[PDB]
Design a protein around this nucleic acid. Structure first.
Lengths: 132, 124
RNA sequence: AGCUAGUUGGUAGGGUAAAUGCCUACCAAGGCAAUGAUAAGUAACCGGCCUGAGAGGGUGAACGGUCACACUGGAACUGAGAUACGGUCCAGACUCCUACGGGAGGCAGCAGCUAAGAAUCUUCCGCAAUGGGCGAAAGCCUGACGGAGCGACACUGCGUGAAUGAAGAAGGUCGAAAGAUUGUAAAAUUCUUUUAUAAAUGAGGAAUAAGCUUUGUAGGAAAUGACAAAGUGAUGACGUUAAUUUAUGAAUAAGCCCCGGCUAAUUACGUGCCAGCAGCCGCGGUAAUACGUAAGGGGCGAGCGUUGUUCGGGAUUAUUGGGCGUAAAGGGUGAGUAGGCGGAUAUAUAAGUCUAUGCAUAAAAUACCACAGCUCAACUGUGGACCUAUGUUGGAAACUAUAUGUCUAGAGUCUGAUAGAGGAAGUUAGAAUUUCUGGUGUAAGGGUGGAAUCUGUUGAUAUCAGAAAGAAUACCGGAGGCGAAGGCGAACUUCUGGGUCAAGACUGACGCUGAGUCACGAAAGCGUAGGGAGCAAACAGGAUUAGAUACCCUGGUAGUCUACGCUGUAAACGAUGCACACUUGGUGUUAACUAAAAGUUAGUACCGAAGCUAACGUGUUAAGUGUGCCGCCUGGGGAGUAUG
RNA sequence: GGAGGAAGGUAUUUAAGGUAUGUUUAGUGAGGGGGGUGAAGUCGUAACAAGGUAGCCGUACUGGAAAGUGCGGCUGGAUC
RNA sequence: AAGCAAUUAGGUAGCAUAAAAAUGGUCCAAACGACUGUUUACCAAAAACACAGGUCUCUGCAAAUCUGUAAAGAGAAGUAUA
RNA sequence: GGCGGCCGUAACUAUAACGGUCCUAAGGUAGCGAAAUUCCUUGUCGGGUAAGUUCCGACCCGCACGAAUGGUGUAACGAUUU
């Protein structure tokens, strides 16, 4: 099967649905996927996400958010760390994505947290993805 | 991109630049004896008759060196100082004779760019 | 691509300040190696230096630390310390002195000579300061080190004047010979003296040592002495020191490269594809901004250019940060070892990661930031840090990793249904062709753009009947089907591989990719043994042509076919590796589910939206958005050659 | 008389030297082979148009030479 | 003396210790024949002959072939893989 | 069993890839070549030797090599020849 990304699969599905301009997208469900979508939700990139059922398997249905002119909120969403190339960073060397206009998402000792929260709590970890 | 695993197994190699002037043996310039002197016709579509010298160097190499400037007095057996520099016209000529060297002197009546042809300053 | 036979390990012993095949005697055959042994080539290493935004790349000058060597090759002695640069012994080469018996010598110490090279210094002063050796001390030694001289070799600073000064001197150059430009530049006037010369003044590197005076302490019967403290106390190679004050006066002082584009800077003469320039593109053949010389202009300046070498520009080895349909680049295809990577979820470990930028260690200098001292700078000194490298202490646990479980949606097994030139073996069939035999029958047949060779009066071709052999399977048959690929089409049986669908239960991540390796792999070719109708390299003849070692025609041997054993190459192509998660549609088609439509699923074709693409084109069977792993590319020729 | 003390003798190890066999590497060598530049000389016209026999790939044979042909494969092939 | 022996260690003796006799000379390159063999008894031992291997051709059995005027015999009490 | 001659021809000189012509059943391909074959000849050059008519490596002007009277090589073998 070599899924190789419970993370990149959802990222790619979300990216594709967002650019074609769908209303909702329907992802596999995991603790990290939930955490990431939660961070998106606070940051105002997605409207909401719900938990569901199909054939006894749980899904996450995410409500894509666009402006009134159908320009997506997500512009570019892309992975940094990667099974063949794992990228870790200290809390000082954390990149500020696009001069802060975007957000960085990392996995740290205290859970999956945004870059600003990682800086404010003085913790660092794996660089999951960058969204702007 | 090859995968990072591929780069680890078969690391990247940068190709090494190669000297244009191998007979100098990374010395700035060398000294030899003119085993022969002549003129040669260049490639197409140039015209002239360029003056060159077959020189046996102090390290045992043969080279063929151009003789810049107008006119010269290189006979046989004359010791010379070659430096780097390739003449595009001539095939196989890859070095220059230095004017003002041991047995070569400057070009007569040179007034612009004298130091490139080894001529003393004409007193004003 | 195999290496090692004191080689690997063991038991004793030799020896060492000390462990060990370090060495020896026996006992085993072991040890290392495609996770690179061994071998060859190259090289002292590091702090650092150069370059660069950084990551990196190149590099190991000076200075500091370690190592090795002191003519080449060994050996031991003395000694706390040497397998000893100016100690000893032996062998070898070289040099020198001999009375011929024999001896003496090692500048990779400081200078210096010869040779070599493009290329590098004085056969100098002093132990005043610092450091070291000996001594109670005075003191002695110190080519370490302090200084001087030499070289524009690099770095840094200063000067060669400064202020007034014409519609604007002479000349030079360009011009129509109005005038421009050199140009306030010069000249002239005024001012100044860093530098130059002379004189005067003149800090600091210096501390005092011995000795002497005095106080106090330990000691003691006590001085001499020792220690702690105060004072006195000769001493500078540099050195005519740094710096300072007057005296004379514009006095002592600029060159080099370039001017077509890259690249800041144009005109005039001479030359005429000659002479020459050039880093690249390229200029010169009678009007050269590119050659040569002048006039102007630009750059830098006691320097300016050239050459050699390194980095950068090069994202042109791309981790940061590149690709493989047609530009160089996807292996012919598959199965799999090592390796890499991998669903959901619980607990534990804390290797990775993160943190207290805890705590240490990363000598000094250098590198970064301030503050200081040389008239400033270079240079020098005192503090302060930024990284990131290792070790360690206490924590965090998401992710990777480790150990033990749980789940089913991935992947498999079982059940049912179903399509198919999938493969191998063994049988059978007909059409057509050729040959042979037997009839009918006569002069042509055959072939081309046109002919001829050839075949035929020994009965051709044509036609009828019979027999034999070989190879290949029209129609079905295609915008099909199956297989990993090559490939697979007359019919039947046997043996046998794979795929697809489903609530239809079971296992519970059992997976993806895959360097070596293995298997398969069109056609041609090779070995052995058969077979040989037709077709057909080589070859023969006839034509075309100047010629025809070809295209065309008539013949024709291998081969084409079968069995077994090799070869492993193709435009082996979709010129597009495999796998998974996603991303509008239109028109056909195959199979299945559904009675069938109608739709779905799994394929298979055409067109096409967005996107992508250098363009062509691609476009749910991506060349779109993401990743896992493997293969491969780094200008062309030489060259897929030479050699192994 | 220890002291085998110290010379001397003997023995092991060993440098240099000598002998033998393989092995790595740098010059040279009659002659031969292809490659590049100079030749614009000689012979032929293979490829680029349907290049005048469509082209090309693998293999085999043959020919002064470019090449020709047999077998299989490809379109990266006009025209209809 | 050790050791089962082969050998190992020490000592002794000589110019010489497989001490006598018996008991390979070796290396490099070329020509011819592959090779072991056979041949001119009595001047030629070889590069000649033979050889395994290869090709052509004959032979359907009262076979081809050979010896004889014949019968007959061999081929063969074999059968084209002969 | 057989497997040819003559003549002319290139940025010196040389040769002749090429062309013409006569004749034949067809005119020697691969490979080899002063050879167990080469008369001229001790051809020419290189190696070996102080000096090499022999020997080895080539050149091709093969009097008069040549493909089962086999051609060119070949590990091993030889009371063979050098």
């Amino acid at each position: 099967m070599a899924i190789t990304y419970s993370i990149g699969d959802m990222l790619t599905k979300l990216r594709n649905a967002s650019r074609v301009g769908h209303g909702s997208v329907d992802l596999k469900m995991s603790n990290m996927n939930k955490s990431i979508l939660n961070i998106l939700k606070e940051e105002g990139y997605i409207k909401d996400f719900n938990f569901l059922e199909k054939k006894g398997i749980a899904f996450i249905r995410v409500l894509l958010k666009y402006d009134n002119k159908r320009n997506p909120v997500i512009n570019k969403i892309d992975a940094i760390s990667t099974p063949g190339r794992k990228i870790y960073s200290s809390y000082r060397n954390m990149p500020r994505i696009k001069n802060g206009y975007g957000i960085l998402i990392i996995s740290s000792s205290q859970g999956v947290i945004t870059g600003k929260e990682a800086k404010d709590k003085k913790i660092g970890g794996e660089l999951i993805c960058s969204v702007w | 991109m090859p995968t990072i695993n591929q780069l680890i197994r078969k690391p990247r190699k940068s190709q090494t630049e190669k000297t244009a002037s191998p007979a100098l043996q990374n010395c700035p310039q060398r000294r030899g004896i003119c085993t022969r002197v002549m003129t040669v016709t260049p490639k197409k579509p140039n015209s002239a008759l360029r003056k060159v010298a077959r020189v046996r160097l102090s390290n045992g190499f043969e080279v063929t060196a151009y003789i810049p400037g107008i006119g010269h007095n290189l006979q046989e057996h004359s010791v010379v100082l070659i430096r780097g520099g390739r003449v595009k016209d001539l095939p196989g000529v890859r070095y220059h004779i230095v004017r003002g060297a041991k047995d070569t002197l400057g070009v007569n009546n040179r007034k612009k760019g004298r130091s490139k042809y080894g001529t003393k300053k004409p007193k004003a």
